Design a protein around this ligand. Structure first.
Ligand SMILES: CCOC(=O)[C@H](CC(C)C)N[C@H]1CC[C@H](n2cc(-c3ccc(Oc4ccccc4)cc3)c3c(N)ncnc32)CC1
Length: 447
């Protein structure tokens, strides 16, 4: 038997769904994707449940201060989000010590501003936990209640758990290739060379975005083969593909991103006021998404601020990854103008059609410049032939005002003419993740 407990709760959307409200317990036969086969005790009702709305009975996942499955970097971002207070905290699984735990606490000092401090929660051999040897606990709940009463060596006294919203409902099972009539297109968000993007409702009860490709732009079989790879590229910094309509005009259904593209955002009243540390955090988020793409031996092929999306909570998500590969070159698409932008494209991709993760790295450098200039066109004052000929002679965009030199150094490494000399996204991810926390210890060595 495998017994579980509901963390959040939500009611029916699909066929024979269950209706709990907040706190309830149940048993599950076995797992089927992310919709587990659910059996309830004090309900007599049988159905399916969202797997991300439940957790094991006597596991930490039931606790409001435990954040399962998040990274150190995402712990810092979550805690520094608006709505959290001094001493806001979470306990999470440790990244550098398997089976152990880490405490992350929101701190403030006038010198460094808003920071997050991390503490190693060590496990005792015969049960229990401690941060400092003089203060041991039987449970993590006892550790929390202790440090809620006084800092006792921590940077702050613990106040409230990090804020968190109910996660997105998992996509309906057996709903990969969906009928076009299941979608109501409600608001056109944009028009492009090869298609449009709509805000839409799926089956009357789910908000999504739909990219509607122009007729003649893709073939069903080639797109589906590629889309079946795209849908497996699941990462918090890539936009999620939910479903496709595999008939011309092909529709691509993804999660809806309230703030549009990063280009739109940086050029908006709100985005143009983001401070430089937030711009660098955007850069780190995209680099994390690209390091995942790199790890998966995939190629974006059209990386630019216009192809980064921004959530309501300012999460950057890579969009259109791989899509350029399945846009056909024929009489229909030719009428629409340039397929890829010269100013973003690595020279070997322009000259020989050699698109690799290394030509993505080049494009990422251009994107970094877009970010720090709040969406300025690359190579201002220069035509496309001028850019190509200048690059061949070692010209690179000069460092703009309000650009840290180390960020520019990353750009210059991305813009090596020889692709092999360009860094990995794994390397870029590490430098950007640790941009300001250089010359600092990873964990606080509390006495
Ligand atoms: C020049 C165009 O510029 C415009 O018109 C406007 C101008 C503004 C100022 C009005 N900006 C555009 C910017 C982009 C924006 N857009 C595009 C997508 C999307 C991207 C890829 C995708 O498919 C994928 C395919 C493969 C992999 C992953 C996803 C599905 C949806 C998307 C989304 N899911 N949620 C919100 N906005 C979203 C629409 C408006």
């Amino acid at each position: 038997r495998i017994i579980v407990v509901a963390l959040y709760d939500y009611e029916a959307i699909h066929h024979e769904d269950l209706s709990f409200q907040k706190g309830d317990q149940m048993v599950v036969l076995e797992e089927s994707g992310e919709w587990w086969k659910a059996r309830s005790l004090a309900t007599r009702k049988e159905g399916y449940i969202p797997s991300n709305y439940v957790a094991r009975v006597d596991s930490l996942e039931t606790e409001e201060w435990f954040f399962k499955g998040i990274s150190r970097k995402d712990a810092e971002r979550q805690l520094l989000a608006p709505g959290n207070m001094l001493g806001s905290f979470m306990i999470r699984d440790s990244e550098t010590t398997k089976g152990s735990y880490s405490l992350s606490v929101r701190d403030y000092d006038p010198r460094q501003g808003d920071t997050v401090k991390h503490y190693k929660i060590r496990t005792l051999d015969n049960g229990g936990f401690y941060i400092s040897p003089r203060s041991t606990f039987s449970t993590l709940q006892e550790l929390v209640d202790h440090y809620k009463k006084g800092n006792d060596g921590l940077c702050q006294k613990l106040s409230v758990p990090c804020m968190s919203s109910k996660p997105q409902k998992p996509w309906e099972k057996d709903a990969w290739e969906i009928p076009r009539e299941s979608l109501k297109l409600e608001k056109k968000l944009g028009a492009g060379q090869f298609g449009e993007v709509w805000m839409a409702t799926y089956n009357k009860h789910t908000k999504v975005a739909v990219k509607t490709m122009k007729p003649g732009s893709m073939s069903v079989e080639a797109f589906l083969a590629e889309a079946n790879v795209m849908k497996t590229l699941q990462h918090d910094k890539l936009v999620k593909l939910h479903a496709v309509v595999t008939k011309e005009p092909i529709y691509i259904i993804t999660e809806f991103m309230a703030k549009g593209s990063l280009l739109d955002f940086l050029k908006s009243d709100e985005g143009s006021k983001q401070p430089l540390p937030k711009l660098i955090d955007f850069s780190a988020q995209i680099a994390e998404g690209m390091a995942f793409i790199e790890q998966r031996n995939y190629i974006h092929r059209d990386l630019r601020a216009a192809n980064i999306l921004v959530s309501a909570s300012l999460v950057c998500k890579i969009a259109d990854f791989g899509l350029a590969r399945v846009i056909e070159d024929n009489e229909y698409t030719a009428r629409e103008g340039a397929k890829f932008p010269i100013k973003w494209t690595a020279p070997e991709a322009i000259n020989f059609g050699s698109f690799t993760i290394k030509s993505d790295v080049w494009s990422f450098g251009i994107l970094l410049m877009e970010i720090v200039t709040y969406g300025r066109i690359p190579y201002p004052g220069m035509s496309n032939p001028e850019v190509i000929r200048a690059l061949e002679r070692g010209y690179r965009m000069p460092r703009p005002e309000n650009c840290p030199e180390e960020l520019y150094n990353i750009m210059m490494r991305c813009w090596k003419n020889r692709p092999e000399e360009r860094p990995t996204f794994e390397y870029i991810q590490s430098v950007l993740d640790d941009f300001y926390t250089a010359t600092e210890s990873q964990y606080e060595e509390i006495p």
